[PDB]
Design a protein around this ligand. Structure first.
Ligand SMILES: Nc1ncnc2c1ncn2[C@@H]1O[C@H](COP(=O)(O)OP(=O)(O)OP(O)(O)=S)[C@@H](O)[C@H]1O
Ligand SMILES: Nc1ncnc2c1ncn2[C@@H]1O[C@H](COP(=O)(O)OP(=O)(O)OP(O)(O)=S)[C@@H](O)[C@H]1O
Ligand SMILES: Nc1ncnc2c1ncn2[C@@H]1O[C@H](COP(=O)(O)OP(=O)(O)OP(O)(O)=S)[C@@H](O)[C@H]1O
Ligand SMILES: Nc1ncnc2c1ncn2[C@@H]1O[C@H](COP(=O)(O)OP(=O)(O)OP(O)(O)=S)[C@@H](O)[C@H]1O
Ligand SMILES: Nc1ncnc2c1ncn2[C@@H]1O[C@H](COP(=O)(O)OP(=O)(O)OP(O)(O)=S)[C@@H](O)[C@H]1O
Ligand SMILES: Nc1ncnc2c1ncn2[C@@H]1O[C@H](COP(=O)(O)OP(=O)(O)OP(O)(O)=S)[C@@H](O)[C@H]1O
Ligand SMILES: [Cl-]
Ligand SMILES: [Cl-]
Ligand SMILES: [Cl-]
Ligand SMILES: [Cl-]
Ligand SMILES: [Cl-]
Ligand SMILES: [Cl-]
Ligand SMILES: [Mg+2]
Ligand SMILES: [Mg+2]
Ligand SMILES: [Mg+2]
Ligand SMILES: [Mg+2]
Ligand SMILES: [Mg+2]
Ligand SMILES: [Mg+2]
Lengths: 218, 214, 217, 219, 217, 222
């Protein structure tokens, strides 16, 4: 009678151990952090590994970084996203305003079905934020997408995200930190919450190298 | 003394000196992922399973289907209890007066003794919260109400008034010590009765909340 | 033509800390975070007034029902129901559906029951003036009054709006401080205009006989 | 020839005239700021009372909250009979407290002329607070009164007063503190600034007793 | 293709900790409290580009006059008026006596005029974030490699002033001037470089007669 | 001449010319910021007084709250006879203080300019919405520079180790920044002076202790 909720493996080294199997399938995981913490990298590695390891197609939704820079930056880690877009295994949805929510979603829906995507990454007034963020989560759940949603925060040990509500609306919450002490920076990942399932607790150190994120349950 | 109802949440009835005061409202406040919803659910589930006391769960964001799914993680089959008419999940998710009349109706219909209510001006909140607590008191329900807070050692709840309108106040914390998280539960206040003081560690496992007093 | 006199609370240790009790004919502000003992102090004040001196009391509640006030005092062995049945205690229910209307009601009750002790439980610019009015009008009636107020930090503002301590003649702070994982309650008399008192924090506990304070003296 | 540029009048408050190197600058206003129950009213009353008793200098006490009756009653704590001084026309308590600014200044002026007062105690947005306070100070100076002005603050170490402008407009600033440390309170007085002369600096301990304020200047 | 390439600053110590210099074709935010060396860094970027690589530079100023930028550069033995006269450098005076699109076309007009490869820009949140993004995107489409300075008011607080600048920039450098025990210590940090690697944390530096010197310590 | 790095004018304030390696940058404004009673007015008077006495460089003092009479009176604390200097036409105190019973900075700047011309002054002291503050200070600084004045500008702050001035913009619009502190350490006060920045030239770093004496500011060696 003890039924566990299903998880999808990220294959990001060390993360699937911390999360006891990966990300809860069919739900959204908030990945929050200050600048340069690895939010986009995590969200890319999620889709890249799904395609390469499991032939699970992905939709990356971007709101500021252009598709070409995303693909360009992913070359830092030896990943050819251009090739995956050419094969129709990756779709980069450009939702970044040229130099509204209902429309964005059916766009994502259309892209999910067109590419048969199972994995989605979305990168990146409190009252309106909470309620508009809930319905975004709500709709993705109905599609059956497993989704990484990045958010920004401005303090390493302050609120989880910018408006103090995002962490309460999300099913799952991951926090990327880049803590400065004694003039040195230390990267850590923490799974704060996974509704309805177990996970390791606290911060785990990680590095970003030529092969992406490396977490040490170490 | 004052009559209490057993939560049967491991360790909690020892800390509260016998359980939660019957007919009164208990605030359960914590940061994200502290175990608020779990405490709420466990409170109703145990009431039903061990004492045949029916319950009403009121949810303002989480869907009933997710509540049920997330609870099967603990081997608790809530759909069964709903089917047997012993649990009712009130979906107020995605008008305070109408809500209260809806809660009231659900209590009468299912004959509930236990209620869990899960999750802007400073004293519209106080006024409206006081209203809700006041009416549940008249009905005679014993209520667990959860609230969010954003800091482990800061205000009790979001608006700085919630703990003053509640009869009882429980704080769930999830504190960083170095790079590790330690969960604790504290009964800050129980009106009209004694209780253990300060913080007590707990874990969440496959069997729910497990608190270690003494 | 002499320094203000005091009325004994008979709350163990408090009359030592205050050097004789609460200043007569004035209000004393009693401030604290949730569950610090504010209502208890303000009940014990009235209860001891009745039991020890046959001084009738009026309790003004704004949220807690009279029945709850009574039920909650049973854990101390205080039979408030009987005191209310005897006409010695009047619990004024001021829980809402203009404090000018409240004042006359209080005055009304104060005169029928011949009360000498009162407890009131419980825009910054407006707060200050409204509190000032209340203190002043209670002073005119001649009532010795405890009024509780809320605060949200143990070692921060005296009260909520940062003005209450400045309008009040007398100020008591109840604290409930974390020491390790344990809690420590303390009572402090911050100020009493026109008279002397002990300084700093004194530990207390809440027991089956109410507030129990320890000055080492 | 005491080699300091600003003439001072003695408060005769024990230890304060040492710390201030002679007392309060004559014809100027001194801000006295403190948290609740720090002694601000006591200091401003003791200033007037001593002026009267020691030098027969009449004094005006302006109160915005406490009633005259309570001011008088509370001074009895220190053995001071202010009603007697009011009856003798040596003390005037100006009641500006609210019923249970340009015109207030004229009342003050009228009282000062009527009672020949030498000492004044006034007891007790930022854009307009500054200019109104500046106005009040300047007018008392024009009259030639020597003024104690009390203000509130909410932290022992933090803003001098409430609006972050009071200490910049005043010529002199005194801070009363009531510091809680290790569950014990200790009172101190500091003269932060006195334009035009030296003064002792830092915090000095004091007590409030049956004789009023007692300050201990050390060195 | 392959990873983003870098442009050498020739600022001693910087090209080592950035592993090659500034990412080409992109903007780098250089944030710092007052007198941290922000203008000096953005000047040295252009100056070295001109002197070492004959890469012309455009310096955009919003407050300091060109005359003062030139005067202050004499502190380091650099003759900016000569470089301006030769057509190697252009100091674009956008200082008042804001339309961002007009400013952008002036920058574009200068870059085409002087064939510049390097640009230094010195110096609600919804508004700020949007405009900065447009400025950054435009410089990217032009091909400029850009240093943009910003102000911050705390050494270990927000990266810039509006809480958004560090999130729309591709690259972020933080200059600090930390006061500890009555002494100041200058440090430089590369916080992030999108799509490429760099050393982490604070590195001490000094400003002397020959500009910025960063020490790998 | 102007092919050279910026030149400095000596303050002759004890120790200050050492810390600043020559004095205040000529032709520019220096912000002098501090909490209450830190010695801002004293620094800005001593700057002018020394200019007149040591170099026969006339000074203009612009006061926005303290009356000229009080400024002169209080300066006697330091042995300085400012009335004598006013009388000889070497010092001019411009009273910009408000009547005891919006502000036009353009008009005031023009009144400052005439005084500078009339008294042929080389040294000026000015005592004492963020966007509006920034723009207005910018125009004042810019105009003084055009006039060629070397200027001390005082500002208030409310924390010893918090913001440099009140509005978080003053220290960015100013060419030079000096911070006067009055730090409470264990019930004692310690006065320190720091030159935070001087655009275009070098200076010593961090805090230097000073005292105010019957001869004014006295900054102790490092
Ligand atoms: N089977 C399990 N074993 C161990 N831990 C579990 C298990 N199931 C859930 N948890 C933990 O319980 C947490 C969820 O507790 P909740 O009661 O949903 O918290 P919450 O305080 O209500 O959070 P919100 O409403 O999302 S802010 C998860 O983050 C896990 O840490
Ligand atoms: N018999 C008892 N023995 C020990 N402690 C008791 C007993 N009865 C009550 N208490 C304690 O007293 C507290 C209630 O104190 P109150 O005076 O009601 O506090 P309060 O400061 O008025 O809080 P509010 O109004 O709810 S914010 C409870 O939280 C218990 O800790
Ligand atoms: N005889 C006395 N012996 C010792 N202390 C006394 C005596 N009389 C009064 N006090 C003390 O003096 C304090 C009153 O000081 P005040 O001058 O009224 O303070 P205040 O700073 O004006 O405070 P406000 O106006 O109420 S915020 C009381 O709180 C007592 O601590
Ligand atoms: N002869 C002296 N010897 C020692 N200290 C003195 C002497 N004369 C004045 N002072 C000190 O100088 C201080 C005043 O310095 P100012 O220059 O007026 O300060 P300020 O920073 O301008 O303060 P404001 O404008 O009133 S906020 C006084 O508070 C005294 O501490
Ligand atoms: N090959 C590499 N080796 C080491 N670190 C690298 C490499 N490539 C990129 N990085 C690091 O990855 C960081 C960028 O990670 P991102 O995922 O872009 O961060 P981000 O959290 O999304 O930041 P934003 O969107 O700009 S706020 C850079 O700042 C580098 O520190
Ligand atoms: N020859 C030099 N030797 C040493 N330090 C110097 C020299 N010339 C200038 N400096 C220093 O350089 C600092 C100025 O650096 P800038 O680049 O102008 O700083 P900034 O961060 O742009 O400051 P702003 O724009 O005024 S907030 C001065 O405050 C001096 O400390
Ligand atoms: Cl790393
Ligand atoms: Cl756990
Ligand atoms: Cl206790
Ligand atoms: Cl004392
Ligand atoms: Cl340096
Ligand atoms: Cl000194
Ligand atoms: Mg990113
Ligand atoms: Mg929950
Ligand atoms: Mg209470
Ligand atoms: Mg007072
Ligand atoms: Mg600059
Ligand atoms: Mg001054």
């Amino acid at each position: 009678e003890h039924q566990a909720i299903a998880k999808m493996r990220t294959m990001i080294e060390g993360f699937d151990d911390i999360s006891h199997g990966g990300l809860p399938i069919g739900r959204s995981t908030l990945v929050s952090g200050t600048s340069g913490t690895g939010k986009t990298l995590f969200s890319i590695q999620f889709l890249y590994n799904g395609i390469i390891e499991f032939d699970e197609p992905g939709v990356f939704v971007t709101f500021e970084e252009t598709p070409q820079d995303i693909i360009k930056n992913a070359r830092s880690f030896g990943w050819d996203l251009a090739k995956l877009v050419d094969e129709g295994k990756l779709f980069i949805l450009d939702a970044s305003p040229d130099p509204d929510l209902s429309a964005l979603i059916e766009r994502i829906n259309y892209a999910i079905q067109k590419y048969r995507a199972r994995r989605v990454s979305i990168d990146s007034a409190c009252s309106v934020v909470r309620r508009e963020l809930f319905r975004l989560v709500a709709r993705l759940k109905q599609i059956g997408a497993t989704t990484v949603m990045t958010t920004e925060r401005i303090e390493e040990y302050g609120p989880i995200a910018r408006y103090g509500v995002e962490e309460f609306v999300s099913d799952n919450v991951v926090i990327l930190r880049n803590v400065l002490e004694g003039e040195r920076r230390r990267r850590t990942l923490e799974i704060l919450k996974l509704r309805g399932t177990s996970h390791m607790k606290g911060e785990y150190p990680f590095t970003i190298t030529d092969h992406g994120i490396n977490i040490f349950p170490l």
